[PDB]
Amino acid sequence: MDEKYVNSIWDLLKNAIQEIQRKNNSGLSFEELYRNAYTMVLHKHGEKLYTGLREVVTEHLINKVREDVLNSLNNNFLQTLNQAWNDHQTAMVMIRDILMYMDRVYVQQNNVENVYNLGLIIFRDQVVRYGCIRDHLRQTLLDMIARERKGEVVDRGAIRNACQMLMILGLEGRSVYEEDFEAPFLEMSAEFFQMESQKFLAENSAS
Amino acid sequence: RQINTEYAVSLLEQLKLFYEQQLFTDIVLIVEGTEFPCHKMVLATCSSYFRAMFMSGLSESKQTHVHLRNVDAATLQIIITYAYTGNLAMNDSTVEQLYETACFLQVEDVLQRCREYLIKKINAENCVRLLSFADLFSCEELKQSAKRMVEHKFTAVYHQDAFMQLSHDLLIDILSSDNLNVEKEETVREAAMLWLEYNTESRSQYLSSVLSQIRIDALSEVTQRAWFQGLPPNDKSVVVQGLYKDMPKFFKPRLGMTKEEMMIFIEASSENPCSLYSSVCYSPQAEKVYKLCSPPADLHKVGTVVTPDNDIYIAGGQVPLKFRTVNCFYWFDAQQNTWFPKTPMLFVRIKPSLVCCEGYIYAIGGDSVGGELNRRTVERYDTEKDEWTMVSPLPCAWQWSAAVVVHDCIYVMTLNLMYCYFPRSDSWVEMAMRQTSRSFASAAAFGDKIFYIGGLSSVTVEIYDVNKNEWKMAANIPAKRYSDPCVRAVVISNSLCVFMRETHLNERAKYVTYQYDLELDRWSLRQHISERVLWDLGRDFRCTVGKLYPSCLEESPWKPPTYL
Amino acid sequence: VVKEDNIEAVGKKLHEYNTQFQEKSREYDRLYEEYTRTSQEIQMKRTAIEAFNETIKIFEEQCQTQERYSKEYIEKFKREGNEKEIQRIMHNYDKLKSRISEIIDSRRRLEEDLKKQAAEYREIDKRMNSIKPDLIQLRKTRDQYLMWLTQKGVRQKKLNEWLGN
Numbered sequence: 001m002d003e004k005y006v007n008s009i010w011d012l013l014k015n016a017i018q019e020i021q022r023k024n025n026s027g028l029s030f031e032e033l034y035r036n037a038y039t040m041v042l043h044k045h046g047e048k049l050y051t052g053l054r055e056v057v058t059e060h061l062i063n064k065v066r067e068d069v070l071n072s073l074n075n076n077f078l079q080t081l082n083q084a085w086n087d088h089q090t091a092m093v094m095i096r097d098i099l100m101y102m103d104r105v106y107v108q109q110n111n112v113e114n115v116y117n118l119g120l121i122i123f124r125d126q127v128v129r130y131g132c133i134r135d136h137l138r139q140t141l142l143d144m145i146a147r148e149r150k151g152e153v154v155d156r157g158a159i160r161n162a163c164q165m166l167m168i169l170g171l172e173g174r175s176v177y178e179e180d181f182e183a184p185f186l187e188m189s190a191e192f193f194q195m196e197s198q199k200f201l202a203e204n205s206a207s
Numbered sequence: 208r209q210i211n212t213e214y215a216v217s218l219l220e221q222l223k224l225f226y227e228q229q230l231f232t233d234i235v236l237i238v239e240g241t242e243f244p245c246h247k248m249v250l251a252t253c254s255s256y257f258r259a260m261f262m263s264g265l266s267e268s269k270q271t272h273v274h275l276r277n278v279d280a281a282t283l284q285i286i287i288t289y290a291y292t293g294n295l296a297m298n299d300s301t302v303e304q305l306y307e308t309a310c311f312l313q314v315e316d317v318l319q320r321c322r323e324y325l326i327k328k329i330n331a332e333n334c335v336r337l338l339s340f341a342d343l344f345s346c347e348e349l350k351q352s353a354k355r356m357v358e359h360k361f362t363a364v365y366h367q368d369a370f371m372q373l374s375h376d377l378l379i380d381i382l383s384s385d386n387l388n389v390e391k392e393e394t395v396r397e398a399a400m401l402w403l404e405y406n407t408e409s410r411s412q413y414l415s416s417v418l419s420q421i422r423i424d425a426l427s428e429v430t431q432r433a434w435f436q437g438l439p440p441n442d443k444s445v446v447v448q449g450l451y452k453d454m455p456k457f458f459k460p461r462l463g464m465t466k467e468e469m470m471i472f473i474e475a476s477s478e479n480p481c482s483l484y485s486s487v488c489y490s491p492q493a494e495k496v497y498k499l500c501s502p503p504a505d506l507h508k509v510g511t512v513v514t515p516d517n518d519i520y521i522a523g524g525q526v527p528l529k530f531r532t533v534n535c536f537y538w539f540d541a542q543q544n545t546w547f548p549k550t551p552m553l554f555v556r557i558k559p560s561l562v563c564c565e566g567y568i569y570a571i572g573g574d575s576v577g578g579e580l581n582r583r584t585v586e587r588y589d590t591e592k593d594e595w596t597m598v599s600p601l602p603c604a605w606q607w608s609a610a611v612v613v614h615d616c617i618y619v620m621t622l623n624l625m626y627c628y629f630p631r632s633d634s635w636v637e638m639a640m641r642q643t644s645r646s647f648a649s650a651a652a653f654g655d656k657i658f659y660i661g662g663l664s665s666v667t668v669e670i671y672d673v674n675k676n677e678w679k680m681a682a683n684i685p686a687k688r689y690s691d692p693c694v695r696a697v698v699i700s701n702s703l704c705v706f707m708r709e710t711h712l713n714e715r716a717k718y719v720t721y722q723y724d725l726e727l728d729r730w731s732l733r734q735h736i737s738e739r740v741l742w743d744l745g746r747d748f749r750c751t752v753g754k755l756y757p758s759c760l761e762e763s764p765w766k767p768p769t770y771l
Numbered sequence: 772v773v774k775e776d777n778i779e780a781v782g783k784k785l786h787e788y789n790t791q792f793q794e795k796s797r798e799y800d801r802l803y804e805e806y807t808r809t810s811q812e813i814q815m816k817r818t819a820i821e822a823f824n825e826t827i828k829i830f831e832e833q834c835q836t837q838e839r840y841s842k843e844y845i846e847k848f849k850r851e852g853n854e855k856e857i858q859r860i861m862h863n864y865d866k867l868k869s870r871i872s873e874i875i876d877s878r879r880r881l882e883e884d885l886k887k888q889a890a891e892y893r894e895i896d897k898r899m900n901s902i903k904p905d906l907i908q909l910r911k912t913r914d915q916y917l918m919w920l921t922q923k924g925v926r927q928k929k930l931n932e933w934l935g936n
Contacts, residue, residue: 025263025265026265026266027266028265028266029266029267030263030265030266030267031260031267031273031274031275032274032276034256034259034260035275035276035277038277038311039277042343042344044343044345094263097258097259097260097262097263098259098263100255100256100259100313101256101310101311101313104313105310105344105345106345109345423863424833424863424866424867424870426826426829426833430825430826430829431825433829434825434828434829438818442818445815445818445819446818446819446822448815449815449818449819449822450819450822450826452819453819453877453880453881454877455870455873455874455877457870458870764808764811767800767804768803768804768807769803769806769807770800
């Protein structure tokens with residue numbers, strides 16, 4: 001009812017979701033955390049809740065990924081990439097299970113995306129679609145497929161996880177996949193096929 | 208090779224047998240001190256809330272004891288009952304509290320059943336309360352259904368205490384909606400005045416938003432009375448379907464202002480080979496025929512009734528046996544042009560004499576069932592309670608009888624007798640006998656005189672007095688000789704009239720309505736029903752008097768004009 | 772029918788003439804129905820435009836009633852240094868002028884509707900004026916052939932079957 005009461009509830013929810021993002025959501029009474037969400041959105045305060053949650057998760061993303069570009073970029077890139085990917089996936093699934101009633105009542109009102117789609121969109125844009133990480137990931141993928149073409153074996157698990165998470169980020173099919181990975185892949189494959197055809201037809205017979 | 212039901216119905220009752228004796232209890236729910244041991248598996252399959260809290264696998268899902276707050280113990284027991292049986296206790300006393308508990312637990316099955324149950328529970332008392340209930344929980348289906356009910360009876364529900372406690376957003380959409388059933392704009396103004404003075408300290412800042420929604424410079428029908436009524440005969444109706452057809456929606460005449468008394472003909476003949484029992488109405492003022500939909504879906508031999516509150520209902524009838532008699536009951540929507548269904552009757556009926564008396568609807572006659580037990584079956588219905596109840600049956604079993612209401616008294620007439628029912632005594636009193644024995648006649652009520660006209664028909668008119676209890680002949684319907692007029696007595700413009708369809712030898716059906724002179728005991732030619740409209744309606748048609756929305760009902764010119 | 776001595780050939784012509792006549796009576800009563808609906812259309816549209824006219828007149832009456840109020844009871848609502856009290860006629864004036872503008876626009880919409888329906892009605896009214904001489908000419912030729920070919924060896928039932936297809 002009172003605005004300070006709603007603010008205290010929102011701060012408790014912030015502390016709860018931040019503790020969950022720390023991967024220490026074990027011994028913590030979060031049964032109230034739902035009751036709380038319900039009461040909040042029932043006093044029709046869904047806008048606030050949604051927007052603030054967005055803000056919090058987005059800031060968490062900033063911190064984490066600035067950290068990763070500064071360090072995780074080099075040491076085991078795709079490894080820590082898929083690691084943070086599945087960690088964020090588990091965290092956002094838990095948050096969706098917490099805030100499912102909001103996804104039921106408030107999402108269909110303002111025609112906005114659900115918290116799961118929102119989290120995947122912000123992870124695709126702020127973390128994946130960032131400048132200094134996009135070029136690095138595309139260059140690493142092109143390099144690994146190039147060395148795969150010339151005999152050097154690479155762990156197919158990393159590239160298959162990268163491609164599956166890229167097509168998952170589309171939330172509509174392989175949409176982002178066409179522009180983020182398929183567009184350089186087609187041209188690099190085309191030039192590689194041209195080079196191999198030129199080096200094959202020049203000193204070999206048709207047989 | 209799929210899922211088996213003979214096994215599902217056995218597995219479910221086996222789970223209930225374990226729940227009653229408290230086996231495999233892995234979680235204990237604590238609600239306001241009361242304990243409710245249950246299974247984490249069952250609650251997840253029924254409620255998505257428990258599915259989210261248990262798949263979490265955190266301290267809550269690890270602790271056999273979970274404290275659920277803001278949840279009623281009675282509603283929680285009903286939710287658990289449904290999870291183990293599939294039966295839902297939905298009464299009008301605890302449906303609003305069950306819906307609050309269901310939406311907090313997000314049970315798709317209970318929320319859907321409680322939603323449709325409330326939709327058919329909106330009457331003329333809980334409409335405003337359910338509207339605020341729907342807005343608080345964001346139920347778009349209940350909110351739209353409750354809003355349309357408020358717009359239909361706004362002049363009767365704005366005195367309730369639930370109306371002055373409505374929120375600001377709940378007021379701006381009701382006043383701005385052009386569906387307010389009000390005869391004058393002052394009613395909407397005074398309704399807004401009583402709302403702002405209910406709580407002045409909190410609504411003093413909303414005084415500008417209140418006046419911005421009430422139409423003050425509209426001048427809907429006060430302009431026609433200003434200049435003059437000079438037009439073709441009663442063409443003030445053509446202006447109704449013209450000013451409301453083109454306007455900026457801020458000065459539009461509200462739907463209540465847009466009303467017209469029309470002779471409602473149900474189960475009439477159809478011009479094109481279609482529904483043998485169609486429903487159309489004719490406005491004597493607009494001289495136009497408006498088509499009415501039949502959600503009854505081919506009902507046959509049904510009855511009609513119009514309350515003094517301008518409410519239309521149908522009961523009884525028969526449907527084609529995939530003919531079988533049913534106990535259906537539908538209410539007509541003056542705005543949506545539909546036929547919502549309402550609590551059915553206790554016994555199936557065919558053409559019951561439906562009458563409204565002191566707010567109660569009575570189903571008289573209607574296809575006597577069980578001749579050994581009783582043939583004079585009659586029962587009443589309560590509008591707000593949505594319930595049927597048996598009453599004192601007719602003293603004798605008759606056929607093709609009529610029923611009227613005068614001065615809160617139920618009068619039933621027969622071959623030559625008449626009995627008066629008193630709801631205050633729940634008994635039948637024999638009244639003055641009729642001098643002529645006639646059947647299949649029409650009956651009407653006007654002032655202190657009951658008219659039993661027609662019957663074998665004939666042109667004989669009988670005027671009965673309630674104050675004198677005497678049957679006397681007054682005059683004969685002036686009709687052409689050797690004709691076969693199937694007459695129907697109707698009261699319009701505070702005057703008794705007779706809608707006479709005359710069919711002569713080798714001639715088509717001719718429709719015409721006459722007006723009776725009460726002081727001179729004469730019948731005056733009132734209006735000739737144009738044959739360019741109103742095609743043949745047969746003889747078994749039912750007729751009544753009511754007001755409908757010319758503004759919005761149906762538009763079917765058809766009726767090919769200028770022939771021969 | 773070109774004095775065809777086959778007689779059955781003369782009867783086949785009669786059937787072609789049957790078609791021609793039938794198509795016409797259908798389009799004839801269709802044009803009559805169009806005439807009637809257009810007549811009631813302009814009747815409802817003229818009862819609407821005169822209603823619009825009288826409403827504009829009474830709104831101008833309210834406009835001059837505002838000037839009357841500017842001398843009747845405006846003395847105790849303008850010299851007190853308040854603006855919320857005068858909104859009962861001052862905030863009811865600007866929106867009345869906007870109402871005048873929008874109902875003038877609506878009247879222009881009704882006028883262009885009138886002229887477009889009159890155009891789409893006269894473009895076929897001229898067709899009625901041209902199809903009726905041809906229709907009565909075809910009916911006269913049919914009546915002339917009725918005196919001749921029908922009395923050779925055709926049945927009235929055969930004529931009904933020809934005109935019923």
